[PDB]
Amino acid sequence: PTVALTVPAAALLPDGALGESIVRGRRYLSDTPAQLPDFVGNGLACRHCHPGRDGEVGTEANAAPFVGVVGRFPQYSARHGRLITLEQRIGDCFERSLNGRALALDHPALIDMLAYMSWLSQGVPVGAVVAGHGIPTLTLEREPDGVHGEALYQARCLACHGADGSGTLDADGRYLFPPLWGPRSFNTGAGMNRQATAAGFIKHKMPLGADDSLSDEEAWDVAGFVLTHPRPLFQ
Amino acid sequence: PTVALTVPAAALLPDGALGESIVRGRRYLSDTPAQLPDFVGNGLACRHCHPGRDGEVGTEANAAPFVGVVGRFPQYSARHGRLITLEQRIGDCFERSLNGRALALDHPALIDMLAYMSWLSQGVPVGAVVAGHGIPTLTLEREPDGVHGEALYQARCLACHGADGSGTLDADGRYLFPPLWGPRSFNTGAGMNRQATAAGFIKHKMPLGADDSLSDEEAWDVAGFVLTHPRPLFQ
Numbered sequence: 001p002t003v004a005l006t007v008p009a010a011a012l013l014p015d016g017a018l019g020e021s022i023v024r025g026r027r028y029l030s031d032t033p034a035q036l037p038d039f040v041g042n043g044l045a046c047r048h049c050h051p052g053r054d055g056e057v058g059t060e061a062n063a064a065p066f067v068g069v070v071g072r073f074p075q076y077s078a079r080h081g082r083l084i085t086l087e088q089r090i091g092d093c094f095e096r097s098l099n100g101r102a103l104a105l106d107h108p109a110l111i112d113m114l115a116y117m118s119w120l121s122q123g124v125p126v127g128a129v130v131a132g133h134g135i136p137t138l139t140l141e142r143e144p145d146g147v148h149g150e151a152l153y154q155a156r157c158l159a160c161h162g163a164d165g166s167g168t169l170d171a172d173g174r175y176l177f178p179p180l181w182g183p184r185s186f187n188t189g190a191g192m193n194r195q196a197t198a199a200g201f202i203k204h205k206m207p208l209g210a211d212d213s214l215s216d217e218e219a220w221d222v223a224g225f226v227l228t229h230p231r232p233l234f235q
Numbered sequence: 236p237t238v239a240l241t242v243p244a245a246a247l248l249p250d251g252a253l254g255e256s257i258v259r260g261r262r263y264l265s266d267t268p269a270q271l272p273d274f275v276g277n278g279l280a281c282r283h284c285h286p287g288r289d290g291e292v293g294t295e296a297n298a299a300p301f302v303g304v305v306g307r308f309p310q311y312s313a314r315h316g317r318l319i320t321l322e323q324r325i326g327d328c329f330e331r332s333l334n335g336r337a338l339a340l341d342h343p344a345l346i347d348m349l350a351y352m353s354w355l356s357q358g359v360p361v362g363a364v365v366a367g368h369g370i371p372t373l374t375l376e377r378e379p380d381g382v383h384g385e386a387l388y389q390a391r392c393l394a395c396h397g398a399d400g401s402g403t404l405d406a407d408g409r410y411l412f413p414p415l416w417g418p419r420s421f422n423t424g425a426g427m428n429r430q431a432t433a434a435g436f437i438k439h440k441m442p443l444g445a446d447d448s449l450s451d452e453e454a455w456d457v458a459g460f461v462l463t464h465p466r467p468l469f470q
């Protein structure tokens with residue numbers, strides 16, 4: 001079954017221990033390098049690929065929302081060759097997207113992330129599919145043209161992500177516009193390093209506030225440009 | 236929200252890796268000492284306190300069904316003094332009810348238990364309360380009378396659980412009727428060692444196939460008798 005993407009009201013947060021956990025979980029997801037420096041090896045927070053409005057994280061259709069995610073695990077992973085839990089999946093995002101180290105599976109910060117994801121999933125039937133889950137891929141027949149992609153990047157992306165892909169810092173030292181390549185970006189093991197996933201994300205979410213504005217060809221070619229560049233190597 | 240206790244159809248099991256996991260999970264829950272001997276320190280399987288029909292485990296109202304349990308975690312534990320995950324909760328049942336050792340939080344058998352619980356929870360909204368969850372307690376004002384309880388035990392329980400509480404083995408060496416005290420029963424750390432929980436279980440589920448037949452006084456007193464006896468000590 002597919003159900004709608006619903007976002008709960010932060011005014012109806014439970015109190016007690018669970019509410020305090022949810023609030024800490026939102027912070028870990030929004031501000032991950034500063035909150036979890038022992039585990040993060042780049043400049044990315046979860047929210048840089050799992051954006052949300054109103055200070056929430058992971059609430060946007062076609063940008064891998066967390067709404068409903070708790071009810072989809074455990075599930076099979078071809079990386080692992082077996083079923084994995086949601087804790088383990090978060091571990092892989094720390095190791096790959098954040099170029100870091102997985103939290104222990106009972107670490108309190110990991111549990112607070114889980115509590116926040118569960119809060120966002122409230123009312124979703126276990127096993128159901130949320131409309132707008134994941135990042136829909138975009139695939140062309142034909143190798144991306146990074147020459148075209150370089151021209152598109154300069155015209156549509158550079159002002160935010162920079163001529164050297166290094167992003168723009170905000171006043172408090174967190175990325176306002178995150179790095180797309182180089183030492184502070186996602187590593188080679190990340191899902192965003194796959195052509196069709198980057199092309200899909202770009203097509204649906206970029207340029208910022210212009211969702212679904214690039215033609216399919218343009219998203220494909222600019223993703224290819226972006227992925228020509230060096231970034232940290234995953235072991 | 237409270238929703239109904241629904242049990243899925245084993246004929247509609249998913250295939251692939253998830254279906255194979257679910258099936259292994261049902262076996263670990265039904266036949267735990269034989270399947271997980273490194274982790275089990277008594278004669279109990281999960282199904283001896285979380286019974287189910289038709290070979291399922293954890294599907295009976297007022298006998299702590301697993302239907303819906305996945306959507307109730309993480310939650311606060313006063314034992315731990317913080318939020319815990321469902322994997323951690325299962326660990327505590329291994330340590331206390333099964334007098335053993337917790338599985339590692341990524342152990343494949345634990346994940347297969349989780350997969351089975353998730354399958355049983357299919358369609359339950361995350362966060363909802365399933366009708367018949369847990370084991371409703373029964374509490375009297377007044378200390379249980381174990382003299383009364385001994386007479387009730389002889390008349391209503393002994394034929395199955397034995398004069399020495401040691402249970403009845405089946406032909407394949409698993410308990411048909413499980414031990415209520417002594418070295419093969421639950422340890423002192425288990426929830427069933429608490430007077431009001433044992434009284435509630437008994438009242439709602441015992442004698443077998445005579446749910447809600449003891450008066451409240453009778454359940455209370457027989458639970459008290461049962462809990463006068465030695466059993467393994469929890470560290």
Ligand code: HEC
Pocket residue numbers: 029032044045046047048049050064065069072089090093094097098113133134135136186190191192197
């Ligand atoms: C971009 C560089 C990412 C960063 C930073 C983080 N994640 Fe991610 N995540 C990313 C992709 C491309 C995907 C795949 C989407 C799909 O179609 O399924 C994911 C997925 C997840 C998931 C699974 C979601 C699902 O529906 O199954 C989770 C739980 C997840 N990501 C969590 C997560 C966390 C907690 C992060 C910070 C530690 C994180 N991700 C960063 C891309 C990126």
Ligand code: HEC
Pocket residue numbers: 044047048049050051153156157158159160161176177178179180185186192198201202205206207208222223226
């Ligand atoms: C500023 C107004 C932006 C423009 C123009 C573009 N992007 Fe962007 N991007 C921006 C933000 C604020 C974020 C974080 C997520 C959000 O949706 O809030 C992003 C994220 C990305 C990512 C993922 C994260 C990462 O790799 O660091 C990618 C791959 C990305 N953006 C690419 C991209 C491209 C190719 C653009 C031109 C077509 C583009 N972005 C424009 C902000 C802005």
Ligand code: HEC
Pocket residue numbers: 264267279280281282283284285299300304307324325328329332333348368369370371421425426427432
């Ligand atoms: C009786 C001696 C038990 C054995 C054997 C096992 N469990 Fe148990 N479990 C027992 C009690 C008395 C309770 C509390 C019920 C309540 O009202 O909440 C539990 C609870 C659980 C739970 C949590 C259920 C919930 O709704 O939150 C789980 C997940 C659980 N038990 C699992 C479990 C497993 C997997 C077992 C075998 C390893 C196991 N239990 C054995 C009593 C007994």
Ligand code: HEC
Pocket residue numbers: 279282283284285286388391392393394395396411412413414415420421427433436437440441442443457458461
């Ligand atoms: C045989 C027909 C039984 C009679 C009579 C009684 N019990 Fe029982 N009990 C029986 C089974 C098959 C099981 C497993 C769970 C099931 O519902 O399938 C149980 C379980 C218990 C337990 C929990 C497990 C344990 O501690 O080992 C308790 C505490 C228990 N039973 C107590 C109990 C008492 C006090 C009875 C007389 C009032 C009684 N049981 C009768 C089978 C049978």
